[PDB]
Amino acid sequence: LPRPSGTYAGLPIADYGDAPPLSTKTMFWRTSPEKLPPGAWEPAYLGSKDERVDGPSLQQVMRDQLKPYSEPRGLLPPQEILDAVCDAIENRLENTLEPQKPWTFKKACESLDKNTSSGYPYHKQKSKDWTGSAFIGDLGDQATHANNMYEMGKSMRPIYTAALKDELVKPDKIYGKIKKRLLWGSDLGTMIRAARAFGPFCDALKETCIFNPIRVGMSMNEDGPFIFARHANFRYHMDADYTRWDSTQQRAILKRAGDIMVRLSPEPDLARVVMDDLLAPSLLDVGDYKIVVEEGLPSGCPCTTQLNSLAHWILTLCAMVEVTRVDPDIVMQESEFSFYGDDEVVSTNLELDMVKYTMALRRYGLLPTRADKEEGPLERRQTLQGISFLRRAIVGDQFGWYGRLDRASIDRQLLWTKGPNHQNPFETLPGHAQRPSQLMALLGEAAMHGEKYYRTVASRVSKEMVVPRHRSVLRWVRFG
Amino acid sequence: LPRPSGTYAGLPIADYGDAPPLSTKTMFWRTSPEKLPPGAWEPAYLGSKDERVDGPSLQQVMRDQLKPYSEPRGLLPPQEILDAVCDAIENRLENTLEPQKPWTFKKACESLDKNTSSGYPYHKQKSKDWTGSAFIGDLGDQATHANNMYEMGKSMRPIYTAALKDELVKPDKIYGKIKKRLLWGSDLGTMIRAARAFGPFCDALKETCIFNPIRVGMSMNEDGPFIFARHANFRYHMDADYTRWDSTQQRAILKRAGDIMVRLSPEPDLARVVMDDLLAPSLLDVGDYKIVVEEGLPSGCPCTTQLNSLAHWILTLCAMVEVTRVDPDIVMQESEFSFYGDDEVVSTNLELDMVKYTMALRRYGLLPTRADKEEGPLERRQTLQGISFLRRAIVGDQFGWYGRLDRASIDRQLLWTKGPNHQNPFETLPGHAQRPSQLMALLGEAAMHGEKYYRTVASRVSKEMVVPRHRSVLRWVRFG
Ligand SMILES: NC(=O)c1ncn([C@@H]2O[C@H](CO)[C@@H](O)[C@H]2O)n1
Numbered sequence A, B: 001l002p003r004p005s006g007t008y009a010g011l012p013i014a015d016y017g018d019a020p021p022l023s024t025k026t027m028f029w030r031t032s033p034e035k036l037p038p039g040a041w042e043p044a045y046l047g048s049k050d051e052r053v054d055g056p057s058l059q060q061v062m063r064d065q066l067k068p069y070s071e072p073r074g075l076l077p078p079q080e081i082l083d084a085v086c087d088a089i090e091n092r093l094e095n096t097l098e099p100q101k102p103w104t105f106k107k108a109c110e111s112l113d114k115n116t117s118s119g120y121p122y123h124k125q126k127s128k129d130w131t132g133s134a135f136i137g138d139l140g141d142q143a144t145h146a147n148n149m150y151e152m153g154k155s156m157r158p159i160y161t162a163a164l165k166d167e168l169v170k171p172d173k174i175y176g177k178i179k180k181r182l183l184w185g186s187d188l189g190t191m192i193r194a195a196r197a198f199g200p201f202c203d204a205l206k207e208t209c210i211f212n213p214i215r216v217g218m219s220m221n222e223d224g225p226f227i228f229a230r231h232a233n234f235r236y237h238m239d240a241d242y243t244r245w246d247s248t249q250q251r252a253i254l255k256r257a258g259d260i261m262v263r264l265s266p267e268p269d270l271a272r273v274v275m276d277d278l279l280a281p282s283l284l285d286v287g288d289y290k291i292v293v294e295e296g297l298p299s300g301c302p303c304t305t306q307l308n309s310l311a312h313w314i315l316t317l318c319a320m321v322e323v324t325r326v327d328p329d330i331v332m333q334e335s336e337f338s339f340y341g342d343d344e345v346v347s348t349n350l351e352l353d354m355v356k357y358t359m360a361l362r363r364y365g366l367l368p369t370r371a372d373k374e375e376g377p378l379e380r381r382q383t384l385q386g387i388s389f390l391r392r393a394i395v396g397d398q399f400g401w402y403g404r405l406d407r408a409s410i411d412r413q414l415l416w417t418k419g420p421n422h423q424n425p426f427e428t429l430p431g432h433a434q435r436p437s438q439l440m441a442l443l444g445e446a447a448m449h450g451e452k453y454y455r456t457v458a459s460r461v462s463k464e465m466v467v468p469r470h471r472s473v474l475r476w477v478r479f480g
């Protein structure tokens, strides 16, 4: 790790790799031996061992995912606008966030998801070194060292591990041009430091997820109705529907978001050291090599999705301010935003030139796309109905607004179920005894589509009855 | 109690009275010996012993309050409209209310406010016969008999006790034309029966107070923002601001509201017996006599304020349906209502002829009044801002909507404090050690008016410090 030399997928090699091989397995199993409807989604490509198609290696698929990181960046928004929007944003957070006490090492440790990997360098499930209150063994060593560096304000180089997302995808991403989504896996030391540094801010932010636009932490079922009611106070509604959000980010933008997180943290000088590490040119371990990724979002650790949401807030406000020429905090008097990483809903009373708005977005290097996928510009509508958020269509009736999962995704979840990793997606789980709460929730989702549809998906079990009456589950899913 | 003969205050005497004399005391004490600002509110008239003015007897003041009950009633809304709106209303409640289990005698008993009177015939504070889990002694006898009548579906005649409200009033109601507000005090037996009958429905209703328009049970601070956000989804806003709501009610309207409560109750046949008793010509004990009050609202027991809110819903929908000619449930797709007894906010997208709307209201015998108190018709506005609800002005900024208590009422609460009953309102409590949470809440209210105003009312103590910074209490009062 002196200085880089060599190139992989268009990016500089900084070191030999330590990551385990990409997974060739999926967690999805068919729920029935029957034949899939034509055009059905299926688990993403499993690589050379994947019986369904002869395709490239997982590594080559990953190589494709890394291309956008060497694309030239877009332009910075005009400096004066950028400063004004960041100030307005930080100021809104000062007026809303409840000041927090610092997180302990112990709190940082309990916060981590114990079911995912520790990443570099042990790449073991976190629970495997977890007593219930602390990390011991290898993980305990790594945790404790990182924590000492944190308290001394000393810098550590994060090391991320590249992976590919096991998820259902439309058949074309398997039988046409193979595509599978890139994942950044943080290292345990970095997760510890980020958690201690930023946990307080993130908790304060979540408590605020209804009246601030960063919606991370919200309950669709509990908060959706209030949040959507808010959006509906405004005349115009839209969704830029971005392509490649994370890989098109500018670190310079991310650093402005980071500055805000730092200043709003209980231990700002300790949190600066950590943020500077997160945002410095990143080491990504693709297996054979660790490569240097200077640009785009390094999406590994616990609080990046808030960092990303914050960057999104900054950009959206920048574009709106540039076009309408109204002050960032005045725009926020006339608008309601929802952000969750790249996911967005923007509602405003302001009269926005959509051609200019799209061009500004594209100029910052973002890739917004129209619903109909035709050559731009973005459209705006005068009804919230039809826009979506967190994968749920936004619906309004006489009782209020709410998020509804579309019939296709409901159908899909009836066709697949989660289980241990395996090679052949079309295998049926022999367990024939799953889906406790899952099923119930699916009844909930379906009830919201009317009795006709609900009666069909009440099909059914098992392989314990019986079907709750439609009225009853509809009432239960919408109301207290 | 055979049949009526004789007249008191224009109403028929049915029996000799048993009520204690009207109170000559107030619970309010000055917080300081200083002289009141001119025009300051003061506790209502205390009768012949009231040092501040030579005025009539409390009884004569009450006699005046009873006049509206012998006024001829207004017209019933056209039958076809009345049926349609009631059906739409009952139907909305069916789709929203979570079905309930019957209340036990024990549950009915614990629900009662133990700090108020038992009314007829013991007129003792309820706590005085209360073990912590059951009524013993006299109250136990009365409770247990009423409860047996309830379970056998047997009818009892309610007996209400007239009182006059001890509250702060504008000086003119003390030094000009004396006025003091009539109160109906239910009898313990009736409270038991109404509670067992209607408690389930009322609890189911309260759980629903955000997405149904009967707002009884709401928290201004917690629910206000969501509720007001809902209202703000609509274009037009208004408030009929009624005079003498309760005394202008038609029992026939109240019975339609009652029918709905009955059918939506877990023990409908038992609840019918009770509702028929509540709504039958009522015995009101004014001291010397029990008089028969056939019309207006008998506002005694636990659930009348929901009954009254429901009647209000019926009337408002009737007037809107009559004028706009759109179906009651379609009106409820295009509107948001809030009702709390006579207190109302009506928001709609519908294009309402306000002349026709006022005339329809007046025809049902209601007395809506304009903000400026000039000869009608009611106005509508296009902003919610400026309308009030539950005595709090409705305010909206970039964070959302919320209820704010006006500076005058805040000032007032600094000038008076609650204490034991006494004769001279200008006496200062010698206790000089009160107002724990009270003060804090007052800081909250004042913070919402800006730092300038907030700094002044931070005056202050005591007679423990210190003043929380304005930012801090503003944040605490608006947000989580
Ligand atoms: N489309 C969505 O709802 C979503 N979820 C997460 N992210 C953001 O994208 C990153 C990687 O997917 C995360 O860390 C978040 O910042 N976006």
Ligand SMILES: NC(=O)c1ncn([C@@H]2O[C@H](CO)[C@@H](O)[C@H]2O)n1
Residues within 6 Å of the ligand: B246, B299, B304, B305, B306, B308, B309, B340, B341, B342, B343, B390
């Ligand atoms: N103005 C208000 O907010 C209010 N509060 C209560 N009521 C109704 O009026 C009756 C007597 O005041 C109660 O039982 C309720 O039905 N109105």
Ligand SMILES: [Mg+2]
Residues within 6 Å of the ligand: A239, A343, A344, A345, A388, A389, A390
């Ligand atoms: Mg969206």
Ligand SMILES: [Mg+2]
Residues within 6 Å of the ligand: B239, B343, B344, B345, B388, B389, B390
């Ligand atoms: Mg009002």
